Design an enzyme around this catalytic site. Structure first.
Site, PDB file in Angstrom:
ATOM      1  N   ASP A   1      29.366   9.941  23.601  1.00  0.00           N
ATOM      2  CA  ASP A   1      30.331   9.155  22.894  1.00  0.00           C
ATOM      3  C   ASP A   1      29.703   7.871  22.492  1.00  0.00           C
ATOM      4  O   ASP A   1      28.499   7.761  22.473  1.00  0.00           O
ATOM      5  CB  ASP A   1      31.460   8.873  23.828  1.00  0.00           C
ATOM      6  CG  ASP A   1      31.790  10.046  24.710  1.00  0.00           C
ATOM      7  OD1 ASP A   1      31.108  10.222  25.735  1.00  0.00           O
ATOM      8  OD2 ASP A   1      32.734  10.791  24.384  1.00  0.00           O
TER       9      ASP A   1
ATOM     10  N   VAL B   1      -2.952  39.112  54.467  1.00  0.00           N
ATOM     11  CA  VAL B   1      -1.989  38.067  54.807  1.00  0.00           C
ATOM     12  C   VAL B   1      -2.344  36.758  54.106  1.00  0.00           C
ATOM     13  O   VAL B   1      -1.470  35.918  53.864  1.00  0.00           O
ATOM     14  CB  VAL B   1      -1.884  37.893  56.337  1.00  0.00           C
ATOM     15  CG1 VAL B   1      -3.110  37.198  56.897  1.00  0.00           C
ATOM     16  CG2 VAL B   1      -0.622  37.124  56.703  1.00  0.00           C
ATOM     17  N   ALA B   2      -3.621  36.563  53.762  1.00  0.00           N
ATOM     18  CA  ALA B   2      -4.022  35.352  53.052  1.00  0.00           C
ATOM     19  C   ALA B   2      -3.567  35.374  51.599  1.00  0.00           C
ATOM     20  O   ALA B   2      -3.044  34.377  51.090  1.00  0.00           O
ATOM     21  CB  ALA B   2      -5.540  35.186  53.129  1.00  0.00           C
TER      22      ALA B   2
ATOM     23  N   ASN C   1      -6.628  30.650  54.712  1.00  0.00           N
ATOM     24  CA  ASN C   1      -5.271  30.968  54.281  1.00  0.00           C
ATOM     25  C   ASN C   1      -4.309  29.839  54.624  1.00  0.00           C
ATOM     26  O   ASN C   1      -3.500  29.422  53.790  1.00  0.00           O
ATOM     27  CB  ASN C   1      -4.811  32.274  54.926  1.00  0.00           C
ATOM     28  CG  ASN C   1      -3.303  32.355  55.067  1.00  0.00           C
ATOM     29  OD1 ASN C   1      -2.581  32.485  54.079  1.00  0.00           O
ATOM     30  ND2 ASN C   1      -2.819  32.277  56.301  1.00  0.00           N
TER      31      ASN C   1
ATOM     32  N   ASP D   1      38.524  16.979  28.077  1.00  0.00           N
ATOM     33  CA  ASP D   1      37.111  17.283  27.882  1.00  0.00           C
ATOM     34  C   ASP D   1      36.548  18.178  28.979  1.00  0.00           C
ATOM     35  O   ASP D   1      35.355  18.499  28.943  1.00  0.00           O
ATOM     36  CB  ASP D   1      36.282  15.995  27.809  1.00  0.00           C
ATOM     37  CG  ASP D   1      36.917  14.937  26.932  1.00  0.00           C
ATOM     38  OD1 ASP D   1      38.127  14.683  27.087  1.00  0.00           O
ATOM     39  OD2 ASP D   1      36.204  14.359  26.085  1.00  0.00           O
TER      40      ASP D   1
ATOM     41  N   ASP E   1      34.634  11.883  29.452  1.00  0.00           N
ATOM     42  CA  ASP E   1      35.382  11.081  30.413  1.00  0.00           C
ATOM     43  C   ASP E   1      36.888  11.281  30.263  1.00  0.00           C
ATOM     44  O   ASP E   1      37.667  10.355  30.519  1.00  0.00           O
ATOM     45  CB  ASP E   1      35.026   9.596  30.283  1.00  0.00           C
ATOM     46  CG  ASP E   1      35.183   9.071  28.863  1.00  0.00           C
ATOM     47  OD1 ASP E   1      35.901   9.697  28.054  1.00  0.00           O
ATOM     48  OD2 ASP E   1      34.582   8.021  28.554  1.00  0.00           O
TER      49      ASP E   1
END
Ligand code: ACP
Ligand code: CA
Ligand code: MG
Length: 893
Positions: free
Chosen positions: A334, A287-288, A722, A632, A628
């Site tokens: 741009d 589990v660790a 752990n 686009d 913008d």
């Protein structure tokens, strides 16, 4: 009590009757008090959000894991035996473990729900006779909603005004063709299908063209197809590929750890050792070694990066785009919005005859004058400039009021120049009859206006645009009032003057006028200025220098774009330019070999942007393009890192793009790269620390088992180790502010893994140093045959101190311990202090004494352990320092 009107009945019913039923004022809007009353009765204009959060359900879900189930089974079988202290210790340990897992999952879910729902839906609305700017979340059934091009429809609208409306209903109907909208009532026979309802605007659809204004007929759940909407968009699983790679790495590490545990178990059982204690130790090790906090920490760091982005005006949606955001190679933007401020003024005036007139003043203000090379002009003195400003007034479409601009910057600059000369009253003197809309592919607009005081003279046209699109329609010019014709000997010098204007920092335009729009008279050119935004040159230089190849896609002329790029670091001595016609001649193949060598593009179009996107993706590069415009949206969708705009961006591009900036500037892209690299570095720190701790623990246990001596780690101490390895301290290491020096690094590769040679070497060095220190402690610890729990406690304390010191030096692969500061991430210091107090309590608490069989120690032994355990930190610091110094010296020489 106001009734809610269904879409079909609203389509059937006349507009006036609909307004009567909803008690809605189509002109003055709806008052705020009644808005509050309707919101209180009908709820908000939101989707009904309801889900199960029975905390006990997720508490139980944290159980049933095979490791926890096996631990509980061992606890039960020990209860069945004559031992109870081990049973109570193991059950309190697993209770602590599951509570830690519960808080980890709670924090992960909390970060998940602070993520998203951060871009609210926003639309126009008319209230108390004023167009007010509210969110769509504030809508009530009865308000008047104005629809514009590119805006997303916030709710179901009964349209009563519409001029050439086209609404993209592909989302709700599947038809690729936008549906035209009308205002007349619809017949009952044709009211069957959804697409036939041409007088209702549905929520979630995008307006592609036309103007509209309607009244909300439905809000929230009552709206049609809201059911299918909460069917699809409410739940989704957009798993990040980085998360998948992390899960695969964790699974591979878990499989290797299980194999190692199985081998250790076989060796120990073949050697004639303990059974129950060894089994508990092995299950605790299993589990660790499993990395369980990796997905939690990756979600936490992603949420932290998003929040840090938002805190400084960088809104980023589409979670897995952030992973590839740091691997940015090509950036396109741009030039009027992101690099320079949208503040245009005219400082140069040129006429057909030729007189260098300079205009002073900054901004849309009336303090200013026009300066010829020695004159005083404040009226009708020079006919050429007067005709130029008159043409500017006639062709103007925007209106300036109280030093404010509402319209395109070019028209604002033109009207400011016109007002400076004192002819602001001619804007409304001329009334347009025929209007020519301005388009990106057209680059010129025309109007048809005549004087109202006298109408004896025939119609006269006034149009402006690019010089290339002006001289083609103009073959006549004026010298001293009379009309003549231009030849090549004037076209060439006009081209030279255009190039000179395009030099430095000026913008080039043209003015023309004539009786019919097939033969005009040339007036001259206007020197509009465009100052770059502050702190953009250094940003561009430091971006292009390291790993980026930023290009320019602007609609200006050749000389203007070249000069602007030369002002910044975009332009070099080996760069070229591609014209719009040239980029249109070649689709993909011929453009592939020239894109990496061009940094400046001529006047382009969204189709040209799509062509550049296709060419760049063909070569295998990542593009971050900011747009913008409505057209686009396809470019933003195709681009992986497409950026939208907050103030100058439409809702269509806002939704299509994966990144939205509330302020247009070329500074958040470096911020995006910096946070991406910082979160990647934090993930690397977490991975390295966890791998080093797991490798050291596994090697120590393997050496303990193989050499046939009891392991000085037990099971409860292993569980505590752990918890340390993936818990509060691990998440503290994962949470770290972005380092200042993180941008001076080449961009990462998407196919690169998380484990490198340097990381593996550092992990191995740290693990071997920890193992050697523990072995030395044991050798100096056992000099006789009597074994006491004090020795095991000393070994556990040494291991804890080694882990803490390793975590201390694992927060920077390149920075030193004092370069980042002793107290920079307070979470790490708090976790270290909490771990110290927890260890002290475990050592010195009679209940915890019975639980952890820690016995007792002395101050001198603790001081000796602290002095000896610092070996990892100093060695890591010196090796990092010497490696960094050698690398810097080699790269400098
Ligand atoms: N109001 C207007 N009237 C006439 N022409 C205009 C205009 N506004 C812009 N233009 C012309 O359109 C050309 C290109 O403009 P376009 O709108 O395509 O890009 P842009 O002017 O916004 C610069 P960019 O795209 O880099 O932000 C310019 O050369 C300019 O001459
Ligand atoms: Ca673990
Ligand atoms: Mg543009």
């Amino acid at each position: 009590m106001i009734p809610v009107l269904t879409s079909k009945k609203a389509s059937e019913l006349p507009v006036s009757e609909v307004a009567s039923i909803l008690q809605a004022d189509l002109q003055n809007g709806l008052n705020k008090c009644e808005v509050s009353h309707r919101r209180a009765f009908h709820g908000w204009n939101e989707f009904d959000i309801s889900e199960d959060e029975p905390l006990w359900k997720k508490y139980i879900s944290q159980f049933k894991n095979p490791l926890i189930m096996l631990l509980l089974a061992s606890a039960v079988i020990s209860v069945l035996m004559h031992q109870f202290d081990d049973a109570v210790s193991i059950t309190v340990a697993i209770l602590i473990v599951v509570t830690v897992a519960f808080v980890q999952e709670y924090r992960s879910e909390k970060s998940l729900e602070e993520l998203s729902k951060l871009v609210p839906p926003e639309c126009h609305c008319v209230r108390e006779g004023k167009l007010e700017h509210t969110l769509a979340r504030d809508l009530v059934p009865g308000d008047t909603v104005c629809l514009s091009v590119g805006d997303r429809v916030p709710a179901d609208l009964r349209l009563f005004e519409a001029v050439d409306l086209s609404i993209d209903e592909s989302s709700l109907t599947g038809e690729t063709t936008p549906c035209s909208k009308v205002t007349a009532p619809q017949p009952a026979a044709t009211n069957g299908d959804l697409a036939s309802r041409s007088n209702i605007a549905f929520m979630g659809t995008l307006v592609r063209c036309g103007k509209a204004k309607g009244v909300v007929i439905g809000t929230g759940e009552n709206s049609e197809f809201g059911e299918v909407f909460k069917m699809m968009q409410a739940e989704e699983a957009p798993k990040t590929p980085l998360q998948k790679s992390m899960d695969l790495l964790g699974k591979q590490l878990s499989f290797y750890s299980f194999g190692i545990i199985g081998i250790i178990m076989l060796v120990g059982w073949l050697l004639g050792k303990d059974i129950l204690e060894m089994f508990t130790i092995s299950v605790s090790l299993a589990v660790a070694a499993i990395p369980e906090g990796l997905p939690i920490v990756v979600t936490v760091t992603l949420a932290l990066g998003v929040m840090r982005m938002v805190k400084k005006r960088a809104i980023v949606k589409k979670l897995p785009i952030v992973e590839t955001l740091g691997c940015c190679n090509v950036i396109c933007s741009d030039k009027t919005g992101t690099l320079t401020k949208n503040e245009m003024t005219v400082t140069h005036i040129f006429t057909s005859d030729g007189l260098h007139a300079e205009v002073t003043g900054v901004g849309y203000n009336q303090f200013g004058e026009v300066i010829v090379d020695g004159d005083v002009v404040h009226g009708f003195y020079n006919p050429a400039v007067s005709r130029i400003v008159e043409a500017g007034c006639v062709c103007n479409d925007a209106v300036i009021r109280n030093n404010t601009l509402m319209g395109k910057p070019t028209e604002g600059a033109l009207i400011a120049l016109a007002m400076k000369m004192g002819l602001d009253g001619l804007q409304q003197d001329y009334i347009r009859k025929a209007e020519y809309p301005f388009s990106s592919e057209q680059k010129w607009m025309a109007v048809k206006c005549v004087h109202r005081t006298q109408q004896d003279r025939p119609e006269i046209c006034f149009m402006k645009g690019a010089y290339e699109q002006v001289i083609k329609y103009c073959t006549t010019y004026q010298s001293k009032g009379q009309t003549l014709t231009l030849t090549q000997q004037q076209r060439d010098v006009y081209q030279q003057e255009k190039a000179r204007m395009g030099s430095a920092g000026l913008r080039v335009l043209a003015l023309a006028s004539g009786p019919e729009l097939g033969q005009l008279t040339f007036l001259g050119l206007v020197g509009i200025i465009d100052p770059p935004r502050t702190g953009v040159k250094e940003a561009v230089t430091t971006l292009i220098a390291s790993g980026v190849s930023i290009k320019m896609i602007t609609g200006d002329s050749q000389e203007t774009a070249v000069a602007i790029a030369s002002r910044l670091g975009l332009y070099s001595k080996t760069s070229q330019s591609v014209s719009g016609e040239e980029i249109d001649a070649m689709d993909v193949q011929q453009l592939s070999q020239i894109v990496p060598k061009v940094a400046v593009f001529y006047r382009a179009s969204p189709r040209h942007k799509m062509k550049i996107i296709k060419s760049l993706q063909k070569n295998g590069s990542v593009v971050a393009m900011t747009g913008d415009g409505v057209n686009d949206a396809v470019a933003l969708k195709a681009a992986d890192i497409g950026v939208a705009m907050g103030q100058t961006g439409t809702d269509v591009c806002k939704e299509a793009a994966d990144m939205i900036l509330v302020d247009d500037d070329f500074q958040t892209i470096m911020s995006a790269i910096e946070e991406g690299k910082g979160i990647y570095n934090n993930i690397k720190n977490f991975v390295r620390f966890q791998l080093s701790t797991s490798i050291a623990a596994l090697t120590l246990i393997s050496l303990a088992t193989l050499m046939n001596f009891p392991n000085p780690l037990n099971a409860m101490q292993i569980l505590w180790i752990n918890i340390i390895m993936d818990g509060p301290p691990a998440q503290s290491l994962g949470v770290e502010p972005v380092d200042k020096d993180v941008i001076r690094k080449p961009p990462r590769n998407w196919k690169d893994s998380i484990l490198t040679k340097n990381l593996i070497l550092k992990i191995l060095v740290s693990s071997i140093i920890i193992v050697c220190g523990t072995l030395f402690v044991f050798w100096r610890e056992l000099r006789d045959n009597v074994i006491t729990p004090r020795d095991t406690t000393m070994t556990f304390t040494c291991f804890v101190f080694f882990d803490m010191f390793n975590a201390l030096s694992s927060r920077s692969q390149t920075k030193s311990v004092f370069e980042i500061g002793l107290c920079s991430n307070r979470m790490f210091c708090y976790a270290v202090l909490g771990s110290i107090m927890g260890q002290l309590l475990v050592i010195y608490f009679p209940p915890l004494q019975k639980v952890f069989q820690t016995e007792s120690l002395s101050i001198l032994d603790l001081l000796f352990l602290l002095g000896l355990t610092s070996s990892v930190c100093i060695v890591a610091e010196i090796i990092k320092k010497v490696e960094r110094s050698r690398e810097k010296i080699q790269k400098h020489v």
